[PDB]
């Protein structure tokens, strides 16, 4: 109860809070406008992705500020809220990763194989596919409901301030769960996005609006790597740094790093609504 409150700087807490507030309002407006604007198959995928970003912005942003940036312990809503929060966070992250990869696949077929794409794509197949990825995204997020829980960390068995969210399973399980989440959430969609956007860019290069198109596809691959890599790296460091390797320096580093990596995480979703506008004539 006496060592769970991390002695971080206050200047930093307000700096990052201001950053998250700016990201919150920018992403909220960008995604709301995108969703209303969308409201042929590309418009369904952009919609799905825009919705995913809005959910991540609206479901996770204020909670982390209160529970992990401002008030580190006890966790405000107990074990049921804890598990629900982490479930939603992963279901939304997976939905984002799969909608980005799916958009790249759609665009690839639309440009590189337009005759096959014309007969392969349909509105009913587009809707079924999008639902299929929303479902897969939730299914891959199911493990968080048992991985995490409201562990009471104190010198004694209990203390009013000792209830925190943390993995409550064997650390071997945690390592397996993080390895699976990292592979399916980042490396798989990262590889398919990078390869398909590279091929599309090469196809459009040997051929205005298309200059912005090629530059944006490259920008998407770069931005995706820049925003998402630090988050998964932090989670892996959490899962694989052993007890004997932790120091006071490393502890404070970890916390400040976390604050930056999450700022980048929310920045990714705030950036996509802008990207849809920059390139589009409308």
């Amino acid at each position: 109860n006496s060592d769970l409150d991390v002695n971080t700087d206050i200047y930093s807490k307000v700096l990052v809070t201001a950053i998250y507030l700016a990201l919150f309002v920018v992403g909220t407006v960008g995604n709301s406008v995108t969703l209303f604007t969308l409201a042929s198959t590309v418009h369904y995928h952009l919609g799905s992705l825009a919705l995913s970003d809005l959910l991540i912005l609206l479901l996770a942003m204020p909670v982390e500020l209160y529970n992990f940036i401002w008030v580190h312990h006890p966790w405000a809503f107990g074990d049921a809220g804890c598990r629900g929060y982490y479930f939603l966070r992963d279901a939304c992250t997976y939905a984002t990763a799969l909608n980005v990869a799916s958009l790249s696949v759609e665009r690839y077929l639309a440009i590189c194989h337009p005759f096959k794409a014309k007969t392969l794509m349909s509105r009913s197949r587009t809707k079924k596919f999008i639902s299929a990825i929303w479902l897969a995204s939730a299914l891959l997020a199911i493990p968080m409901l048992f991985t995490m829980g409201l562990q009471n960390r104190s010198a004694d068995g209990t203390h009013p301030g000792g209830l925190v969210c943390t993995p409550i399973v064997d650390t071997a399980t945690v390592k397996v769960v993080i390895q699976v989440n990292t592979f399916m959430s980042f490396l798989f969609p990262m590889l398919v996005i990078s390869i398909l956007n590279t091929v599309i860019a090469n196809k459009l290069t040997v051929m205005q609006a298309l200059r912005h198109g090629v530059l944006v596809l490259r920008a998407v691959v770069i931005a995706f790597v820049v925003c998402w890599l630090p988050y998964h790296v932090r989670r892996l460091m959490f899962c694989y740094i052993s007890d004997e390797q932790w120091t006071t320096f490393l502890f404070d580093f970890y916390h400040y790093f976390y604050m930056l990596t999450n700022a980048l995480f929310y920045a990714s979703s705030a950036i996509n609504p802008i990207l849809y506008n920059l390139v589009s004539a409308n």
């Binding site: 060592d3 769970l4 991390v6 992990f68 580190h72 982490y86 995490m148 562990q151 960390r153 925190v164 969210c165 943390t166 993995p167 989670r235 959490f238 740094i241 007890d243 932790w246 006071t248 502890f251 970890y254 916390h255 976390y258």
Partner: peptide
């Protein structure tokens, strides 16, 4: 202290 936040 082995941070607890995942």
């Amino acid at each position: 202290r082995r941070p607890y936040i995942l």
